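User: Predict the complex with sodium ion.
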Amino acid sequence: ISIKTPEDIEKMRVAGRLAAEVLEMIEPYVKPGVSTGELDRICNDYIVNEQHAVSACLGYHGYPKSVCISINEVVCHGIPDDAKLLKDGDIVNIDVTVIKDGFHGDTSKMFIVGKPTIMGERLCRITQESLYLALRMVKPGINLREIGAAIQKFVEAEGFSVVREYCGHGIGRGFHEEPQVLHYDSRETNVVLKPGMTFTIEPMVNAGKKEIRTMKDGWTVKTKDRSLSAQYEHTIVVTDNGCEILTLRKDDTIPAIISHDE
Ligand SMILES: COC(=O)CNC(=O)[C@H](C)NC(=O)[C@@H](O)[C@H](N)c1ccc(C(F)(F)F)cc1
Ligand SMILES: [Co+2]
Ligand SMILES: [Co+2]
Ligand code: NA
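Assistant: Here is the predicted structure with sodium ion placed in the model:
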């Protein structure tokens, strides 16, 4: 597994901040009646013309848009569409990845449009809380297995399920690098964290059953039972005594630097 230098890590601070700032920028546009196609153009224009960066998703394995915008029962990889309008009660993930100065920053959050439904709000909250509990566990010497097991235990106790596919991932000069960061317990996982590892945690949580389905368009992933699904993602670096969140936003309610030292 690659170990980032202080120079590499500073570049990941910059890229992570940019990816966060896309999400802070787009918020006032996420309203009933807006199209997801429009949101994607606003994001790409900002990334290119203001941040002077590029979207990692655009063209990636042929993907036609710059961000992924996933609504309701869509689990991930929702394709921005000029005809797809947001409406009251929708839960919406926007997942951003930018490359700046050769390094990637990858982050997503949920937006609830108009008046929340109670179940949508709870699903989003439990999903963020599962990410936060995982972030609290990251420090050198901990095994990724312990973190995946903990996300799953927490989510399942709420009556929700964890998507097994699409895991978190190492990240740096490459969009996806070792390790795989599973959001569930597996005997295969034996990665003892070391300072300078950079990776994402990005749990997808379904209100219903865990199983998923890819649509005929070749991209869009939905819950098999058409239950709601939510995701949040941060890029982090492991430090000598904990971690540092590289994609933190003003609306996050966890500190950027988490220290396990007395
Ligand atoms: C088996 O299919 C896969 O795992 C393809 N990879 C992913 O979906 C990975 C896990 N997704 C991520 O890392 C996301 O956080 C990331 N922002 C992203 C989102 C979409 C894509 C896509 F490939 F669809 F363009 C690639 C990467
Ligand atoms: Co992402
Ligand atoms: Co990712
Ligand atoms: Na969803």
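The chain has one domain: 1-262.
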